[model samples]
Target: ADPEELFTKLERIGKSFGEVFKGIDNRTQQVVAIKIIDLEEAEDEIEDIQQEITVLSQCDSSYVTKYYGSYLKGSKLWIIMEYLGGGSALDLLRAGPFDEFQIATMLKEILKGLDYLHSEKKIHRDIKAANVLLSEQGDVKLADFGVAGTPFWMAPEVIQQSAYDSKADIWSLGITAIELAKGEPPNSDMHPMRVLFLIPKNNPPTLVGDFTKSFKEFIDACLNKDPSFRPTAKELLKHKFIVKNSKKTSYLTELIDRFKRWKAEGHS
Candidate 1:
């Protein structure tokens, strides 16, 4: 079956106050990721959600998830997005961490995504490996916007719910860099609150195994405890840590197609 028809025919799954459904757009031959968010669950910040969707719609970055569109379907709001077959980055990390070039490619793509988001004056308050999806073609996409508040790894100011701006997202990106570099969430052995405390206290995460000093320093700049000290997404783009002028146009889309082909072969 075609991707669009297969998705539309699949059963819908709902849990934890949210649900995700799959459907393929016949016209585009593209699979769609349909996330359903209830108004009641987001009542406190329905407006924020609307603002998020509005900002997301305007983004045209190859590093970010593509927004097909959205509409209100009964009590649930339907958010149609690009379907990624490689699943979540966290899942891949669990298998094994990425090498330096892989990490650079991933980080560069996501920084571009963050730069695009920040340009819209919208902060992606929650950025983690789980929210960052990997494409089969080796592209990276920043996903998930359920939380409009401060991320766990956000700067102290943002974590304090003070007046920090979208730079907080850059901090989250930095933390994600460390986590991806380590191939696991930082402080996986610690309690949630403890990890939370350590992140914003300006404490850096321990390097896994043995990493080069220069590579470690790259992530350090990202996780710099002070939002003031952490490099902006755009600045990170220019940093020597990131590879220069790697041209991979429509990288995310190519990733999606690669996955589709892999799935067709019944092999990963």
Candidate 2:
């Protein structure tokens, strides 16, 4: 499709170089995300940008964000992606931390995405509330791989820059679960540099609320310091926490609506 003819820019989302625009498909009237990058601004970083596009293009799973297509108009690069109307989990947290049941629902979807990536010999390398996008119907999909894992969510192996793989994402999943329950990642108050050191030095993060036993166990399994001991996404999906607490995608609409209202009130 012709990038110029197919989409009309609606609003800015997020981007590094050039502008990331939210657009509407003229034909289907579908809301889509269009990321525009100036090749001149990319310069030597063009390879990295291309690599992200490549990674996104290979993904084919409901749990992962869908990539429509990309086009180059002059030196401007346009990437079209599915628009997740509910926004990122972190964005939703503006309303408040999610309930244990909600976290369970979110984790189940994410694990499925991770399972698909791992099976394809691809590593997400980044798993956190901010990277998890939700649709209007509350379906969750993992997004944004521009940078790998953040400091707060970085696994020990990843922090150490040692040989790592999909197991690294499992560790971040545990951190993300904590974020969903507590409103932020552990040691969020500490400097990012300090948190990096703390993650490897301290014991694995533990859930400390009135959360159910199964949920706590789920986090423990994902947060195992030894990547070898950590449960794979496929294994985690079978855990009692995920299986017993599974919820319909529509369950998230309440939280999403709450977030929208909260934002409206705050801005008002």
Candidate 3:
């Protein structure tokens, strides 16, 4: 396929330094996200981007962002991906923290994605509100691969640089659960380096305030400091929190609409 003939960039989205343009497919007329990165400015680290592309290409799941293809044109790498009009979970948090129902819906979808990745022997290594995207109908999909895990969402083993696996994603998933409940990641006010130290040394994070017992229990399960005790994504799918509150993707439309209005009002 001729890259030039395939897509036309529409607009930029997200908060990353990398440029992501909402694009339209010329032939299919479908919307897509085209992530453009200048290789020349990568300090000769093309392999890192290549590794991410490799990971994306190998993934195929409804809960995972779809990678159409890529193109290299004059030092710029254009990665074509599925577009999620509802935006990232971080983007929606500007309106407010998600309710139990909404959070449960998101968790179920994300767990499905993680379970698939784990079955494929892949570790996301990074899972957070910002990397979780939602479609117009509120379908959740996991995004980003090459990016480094931030301290706020990094598992203890990841912070310590110890050997780890997909369980690392479970730890981050727990942190994301907190973020959805509180509108911010755990220890957001602390210094990043300090949080790194705290995450490995302190007890696993716990949710405070009023929330359902099921939700709290689910979080506790994910936050287990010992990865061996942490429930696998497949296991978590059956937890009562997810099983009882799981709703159709359409139920999330309200949250998405509220966020759209919040963005329009310049609340973020």
Candidate 4:
């Protein structure tokens, strides 16, 4: 078949991104996802979507999902991205909670991604399980920047929906740890609105105590209501919890070696 004919047939097969995300295309033969957003959620912020694309393009890293290109199809805007097959962290948690080593490995990768994002001054306002995806290699990625940093996973002050930065990602990271340890989010199936109310007002969650003490303390620091007390991604990079964990490092090393051996043996 002709290349053009293949592309044309492929384009016709995948689902169109519509409704909430607007103009998106999931190309059938390619491992790429495209999201098309309206010019503005309202008339006022018409150009914000483009700005986000520019920022994401500049903030590219292995830990972050790669942005491919963008175009205008009709009146809407489209942004191309790398497709992740392993699905979101939320999807896995819903299936079952992770064990200690799995939690550590995921946390390490997530913090590495967060560190990259923070270095660029881009805060991921919406840091929920849905926004964190897995790859075929079983690695985590920082996905979905549309509402990257917002009230849902933001600090009380930032949740008022004002200005914030990468520290907001830290807050969400703490919540993510809990969600991964338990089978559900902090509020345990409560209405999201109610969860928001309880977050800052309830002092702190008791569930965090369930984590390994060192890890729990690190989470407490990130969840600090005063965002200033929270460690910067760079600082967290040096923390004992993520940095000094020899077991996680050993497991990751072994996993990589296992994959290499599989490839050499012509096994998938």
Candidate 5:
């Protein structure tokens, strides 16, 4: 519970929303990542911050990143998490787009994570290539605190600022499929505000180029404009696309390897 006694904060690391540092559990000597959020700097109230922690603490699936615990010292909240060395899918996208089977493999894991969260009344609110992290050993997991949604993956209902729930994540999930396939989400060239306007007014964006009919169908189900019509994460797990193409996470080591080699060659 005590930050100094429990963890030895080490070098700085990756982040999407907060300053992250690599740390070590003093008792176990296990490596961990600590996301340090300064409450004094955050606009949201403590209640909302605690709510994010509440949602994360209850998630127990392997497909979801493990949350060890968190502690507040002064105005800073120190959140402890399992260290994932392989980085995010977004980082892997730098190497190139993923094949359908690889995309489906990650999709299957993400669906399992979303399925668990949705059952518990939690909406990730954001599902994108960036939020999907990998362990060096090739485990796929849904990361982030589920606090905010990125504009690139925003659902039509969300962009409208209307009432929404877990289905919002399904919409983002579809966009992520496109991201993995195309190396970018739809409308990546557009500004956030512009994309926000276009998402709700236009029909759902479909995957372009060569891809399997089932893969396209799976994305269509996730990107449904009417939130009520979108399939739940559980139902999506049974979709023919995922059922037929899902591969073991073990294959992702090739991605990790390529990513490492790409980075070593000075490709930032």
Candidate 6:
């Protein structure tokens, strides 16, 4: 069906590679998120979008975001997914850092999605709190599993243009654990482009906050310079940190509440 026949587009809700609109699905009158990529504005990265849909379409897991459908409307391409009102975890962090328990809840959800992707012989190629979304109910789902990701969240081998595989995802997960706990990647101090060189030269990011030894060990296990040494999503699942603190997403709602009240004060 044509987009006009399927959706009542509303305000733009998100942006990066394209503009994401908040809309209502005409058939069900349910809210949805729509991403429109203008072909004119896309060049080399455009081809990746085609494959992204197929990979996303083939995915099936509660931890993964639901990809409803895609449409090529003239020179524009539209992809729609379930609406997440709580927004990206990055958005929530604007309120403040998350507690270890909250981080574990989200990480557990991420590993499920990551594990499912690996099981299907697919690689997300990107994993970060910003790439993950949280629903109003505190359900965490993976999104932005794309061709390229933010520099800081990228693995060292990726920066080196080395032949990266699934284990690279684990490296990003290590950075994400810190992102959730510290509210940013360790390289937050440097220019984003500097990561292209420093990630490979510098030591793996260290966990510098007040987290438990188990948590630190989990990160050490993830950020191994050699992908062969890094643990896979399944292996990390049994880690004591993930095991002991594996609270359900229900506990994540507090961050949503925190962001709301924090916003009332006009904080960014």
Candidate with top TM-score is: 3
Count of clashing pairs, candidate 6: 0
Candidate 6 structure lDDT:
0.87
TM-score versus the correct structure, for each prediction: 0.77, 0.93, 0.94, 0.74, 0.92, 0.94
User: lDDT per model, in order?
Assistant: 0.67, 0.87, 0.87, 0.65, 0.86, 0.87
lDDT of 1 at 87: 64
After superposing candidate 6, which stretches have Cα over 4 Å from the reference? none
Q: Sorted by TM-score, highest first, which candidate order results?
A: 3, 6, 2, 5, 1, 4
Sliding window of 10 residues with minimal summed lDDT for model 6: 144-153
List model 2 lDDT by residue over 132-238, tens digit each.
99997788999987444248999988888897888899999999999998988899889898888899999999999798999999999999999999999989999
lDDT per residue, candidate 6, 145-169, as tens digits?
Answer: 7674358988888888888889999
Per-residue lDDT tens digits of candidate 1, residues 90-165?
6555444466665666778788888888887777777887888866656678776645523345566665668778
Which runs of model 4 end up more than 4 angstroms from their true locations? Answer: 1-30, 36-48, 146-152, 206-210, 244-268
Q: What would the per-residue lDDT of candidate 4 be over residues 1-268, giving only the tens digit for each residue? A: 2222222212321332343221233345565665555654446555666666777789768888888776665566656677665566765554444666767677888888888877777776767777777765576788767543124455665656667767778888888777767755566666677766777687755344556777777778888887788898778767777765524444543443444454567753
Cα deviation of 80 in candidate 6 (Å)? Answer: 1.5
lDDT of 5 by residue, 1-268 (tens): 6787888988998654468998999999999999888888777556777787777788888878889988888877898988988889999889877899889988998898899888878888878888899999888888875564348898888778797888999999999999999988898898887888999888899997689999999999999999899999999999999999988777688899999999999988
The deviation in Å at residue 35 for candidate 3 is 1.2
